[PDB]
Design a protein around this ligand. Structure first.
Ligand SMILES: Cc1cn([C@H]2C[C@H](OP(=O)(O)O)[C@@H](COP(=O)(O)O)O2)c(=O)[nH]c1=O
Ligand SMILES: [Ca+2]
Length: 132
């Protein structure tokens, strides 16, 4: 896998962003995580997860997207990636805070699954947010 540059257009919620990627606006969805819903007919921690992702990616110097080994988009046309803000993966950061659960684990896009599950296990042991 490799990291590619991208530019934040707008953070939508905890796990969905609008991104300029190779000069075209796209919606991206974070791989392997699910932040609580705030859109579809508002789940506890959804507003917190949205604020965490917004802050983390808006305040970044450099944003990168890293596709996994399989599909690069979902059925809604969204890019599927690990997204990094100054080198720190947002998908892991949310999980480590108990603001996302590991979810939507679709092979072969599971390269960072064990890494994320280890962060989730710590967030659970620490009783953080969703796990409180
Ligand atoms: C994260 C992810 C979500 N999805 C789909 C599964 C879910 O479809 P359905 O909506 O049909 O259930 C939806 C969950 O995304 P959200 O959590 O943004 O709603 O996005 C993928 O197909 N691939 C992925 O890797
Ligand atoms: Ca979600």
């Amino acid at each position: 896998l490799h990291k590619e540059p991208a530019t934040l257009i707008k953070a939508i919620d905890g796990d969905t962003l609008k991104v300029m990627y190779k000069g075209q606006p796209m919606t991206f969805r974070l791989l392997l995580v699910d932040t609580p819903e705030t859109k579809h007919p508002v789940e506890k921690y959804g507003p917190e997860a949205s604020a965490f992702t917004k802050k983390m990616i808006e305040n970044a110097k450099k944003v990168e997207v890293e596709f996994d080994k399989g599909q690069r988009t979902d059925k809604y046309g969204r890019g599927l990636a690990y997204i990094y803000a100054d080198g720190k993966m947002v998908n892991e950061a949310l999980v480590r805070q108990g603001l996302a659960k590991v979810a939507y684990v679709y092979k072969p896009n599971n390269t960072h699954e064990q890494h994320l599950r280890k962060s989730e296990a710590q967030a659970k042991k620490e009783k953080l947010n969703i796990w409180s």
